[PDB]
UniProtKB/Swiss-Prot annotation:
GO cellular component: a single term: cytoskeleton
PTM characteristics: Dually phosphorylated on Thr-175 and Tyr-177, which activates the enzyme. Phosphorylated upon FLT3 and KIT signaling. Ligand-activated ALK induces tyrosine phosphorylation. Dephosphorylated by PTPRJ at Tyr-177. Autophosphorylated on threonine and tyrosine residues in vitro, which correlates with a slow and low level of activation. Phosphorylation on Ser-19 by SGK1 results in its activation by enhancing its interaction with MAP2K1/MEK1 and MAP2K2/MEK2. Dephosphorylated by DUSP1 and DUSP2 at Thr-175 and Tyr-177. ISGylated.
The Protein kinase domain, residue ranges: 15-303
Chain positions of motif TXY: 175-177
List of residues that carry Phosphothreonine: T175, A180
Organism (species): Rattus norvegicus
Residue positions, PTM Phosphoserine: S19, S236, S238, S274
The protein's name in its UniProt record: Mitogen-activated protein kinase 1
Length: 347
């Protein structure tokens, strides 16, 4: 039983020279030498079967990532688990080794306008595929964007992902949310469950702004502070935009706030390409109805060096129906995880 910061990191025959590369979700991550493909790889140990919540996120992510096949979405190369449900306590997920992520890179590295353009292009190319599969990522943030040494970008972490459900998106004011505060669309704090594609475009807009300055654009300390940060830059919502918020607690909260004028993007980002700020403006639109769609963003002039819709594939097999994991008991979720991982068994 090969050990790492001894705990058990027991990874097949084929995965050797374990080097600890931090902590993940329900276990730890280590790089290793894939003795078959003769390439170094990332292996995540997942230990979720105790907690119903851990089981749902683990299954959701595995079902999505095995169905997706796209250059800008992290793939599962392999899954190591016991041959029986009884012996299965841990799952190991093998993925392409990505040396860094955009969080780590933004902490220390200035991005050129060309890198910002290329990274955004790749984010939106992967997001087009995701949305075309009727899936929302719901937790896009720099740490969920993996990069290698040749600047290939892959979206990861579909733990909070859901099938899109715009018909059922409405909710009351101050409804609890799980996804990273700083990347939350304004509507999440007002009247949205985050079941529409527009919530992911907002997150990408936030990431673009963070790429332009190396600092999060809306670093809210609390749930309503998130809103204050947003309205500090976009200014008070228009009457028309308020008219779309029929929820009285949310509308009267917004009406209670002092009037704020829009801060021009060119004032926050004086060194930024004007086309990037044009596209940022359209991604960070208050009204989710007026917010640019992924395919429109790809067609924006900022991305004209890369834009090729024939080379921006969509999903063959969208998740047409809700994945009803909400109140399956753990034991059902462990069996589905077992069944979902079966294709990787010599067995």
């Amino acid at each position: 039983a090969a050990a790492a910061g001894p705990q058990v990191f027991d990874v097949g025959p084929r995965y050797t020279n374990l080097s600890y590369i931090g902590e993940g979700a329900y276990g730890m991550v280590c790089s290793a030498y894939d003795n078959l493909n003769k390439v170094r790889v990332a292996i995540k140990k997942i230990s979720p079967f105790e907690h119903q919540t851990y089981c749902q996120r683990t299954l959701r992510e595995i079902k999505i990532l095995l169905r997706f096949r796209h250059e800008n979405i992290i793939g599962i190369n392999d899954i190591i688990r016991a041959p029986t449900i009884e012996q299965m306590k841990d799952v190991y997920i093998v993925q392409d080794l990505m040396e860094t992520d955009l969080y780590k890179l933004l902490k220390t590295q200035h991005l050129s306008n060309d890198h910002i353009c290329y990274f955004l292009y790749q984010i939106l190319r992967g997001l087009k595929y995701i949305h075309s599969a009727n899936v929302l990522h719901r937790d896009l943030k720099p740490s969920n964007l993996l990069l290698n040494t040749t600047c290939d970008l892959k979206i990861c972490d579909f733990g909070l992902a859901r099938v899109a459900d715009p018909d059922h998106d409405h909710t009351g004011f101050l409804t609890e949310y799980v996804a990273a505060r700083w990347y939350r669309a304004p509507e999440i704090m007002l009247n949205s469950k985050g079941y529409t594609k527009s919530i992911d475009i907002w997150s990408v807009g936030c990431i673009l702004a963070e790429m332009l300055s190396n600092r999060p654009i809306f670093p809210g300390k609390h749930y309503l502070d998130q809103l204050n940060h947003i309205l500090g830059i976009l200014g008070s919502p228009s009457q028309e935009d308020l008219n779309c918020i029929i929820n009285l607690k949310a509308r009267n909260y917004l009406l209670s706030l002092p009037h704020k004028n829009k801060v021009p993007w060119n004032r926050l980002f004086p060194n930024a390409d004007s086309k990037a700020l044009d596209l940022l403006d359209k991604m960070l639109t208050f009204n989710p109805h007026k917010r640019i769609e992924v395919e429109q963003a790809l067609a924006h002039p900022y991305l004209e060096q890369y834009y090729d819709p024939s080379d921006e594939p969509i999903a063959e097999a969208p998740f047409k129906f809700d994945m009803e994991l909400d109140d399956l008991p753990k034991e059902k979720l462990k069996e589905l995880i077992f069944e979902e991982t079966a294709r990787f068994q010599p067995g």
